[PDB]
């Protein structure tokens, strides 16, 4: 009922569903939206330029009920870029609301 294996199965299912969304969801309202993507943690939709994008805490997480209302955030700039530090090669992401470190370190080991 709570195991690394169960969580892995849930992650796989999360990925499968996200992949369906990426392929099947209709194009954004305009030309300029930030592009949808799966970052191995969460499914990001197309983002409106100039807007924060809010995504529910990924449901496969073992503690996914500690945080039922929670969201993880990206920002889509006016130029249609995901907000990203000059110092980094990954987009800015705030997942503070979806935190539970051993499980979390493993969660981000690629």
């Amino acid at each position, epitope marked *: 009922t*709570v*195991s*690394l*294996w169960e969580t892995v199965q849930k992650w796989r299912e999360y990925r499968r569903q996200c992949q369906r969304s990426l392929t099947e969801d209709p194009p954004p309202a305009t030309d300029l939206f930030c592009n949808r993507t799966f970052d191995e943690y969460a499914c990001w939709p197309d983002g409106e330029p100039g807007s924060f994008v809010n995504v529910s805490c990924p449901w496969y997480l073992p503690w996914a009920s500690s945080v039922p209302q929670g969201h993880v955030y990206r920002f889509c700039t006016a130029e249609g870029l995901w907000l990203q530090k000059d110092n980094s090669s990954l987009p800015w992401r705030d997942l503070s609301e979806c935190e539970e470190s051993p499980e979390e370190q*493993l969660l981000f080991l690629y």
Partner: antibody
Amino acid sequence: DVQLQESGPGLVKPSQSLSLTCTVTGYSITSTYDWHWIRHFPGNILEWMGYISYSGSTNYNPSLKSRISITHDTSKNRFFLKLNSVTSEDTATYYCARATASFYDGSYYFDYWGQGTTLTVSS
Amino acid sequence: DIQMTQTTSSLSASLGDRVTISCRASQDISNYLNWYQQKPDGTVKLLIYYTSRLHSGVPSRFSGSGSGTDYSLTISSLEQEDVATYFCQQGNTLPFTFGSGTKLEIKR
């Protein structure tokens, strides 16, 4: 440096109970990973038996129907295999293993193994 | 209830030669295929997971490939310490199941 090592009786009489211990060092068994039992028959059949998770949740191979229990003692960082009413078909080398996973591709695999302990069932 | 078959149960190759060990699953296992090495003294080591990923510490002479139901482990140049039995394992669905193994020995 994670180490696992099996201990237990090398010899058991038919219909008796089998009890094996896996002693884990270098990592807490109540954190993150799942902890598995696997046995190797003479003739190279390798059979998955079951696991106990870091949370104490278990899951067993259906073939080992009612005969098997996996338990742990978290204060001593050990987990256990009990196999009811063994027969000579339970003669095998018994391994404990840690399972980890990658959340980059969803793979799940046994990254660390005990040395195995041989068990013979005979009267 | 997935059957793993390693059609070759025994193989002999010369020192320095390329070695291929093959595995076939009874159904599509979506690249969740792991390779293990069991030495003659019984010690078991993970070599490869998720078809082709090398576990850290494992020699780069080992590689893996495949998809669907068919997978292979390759040793680019056989060395003495590779004498061992090699097992595949699907990690797609419970119960986990292993191939019957391929025992690798030296051809002289």
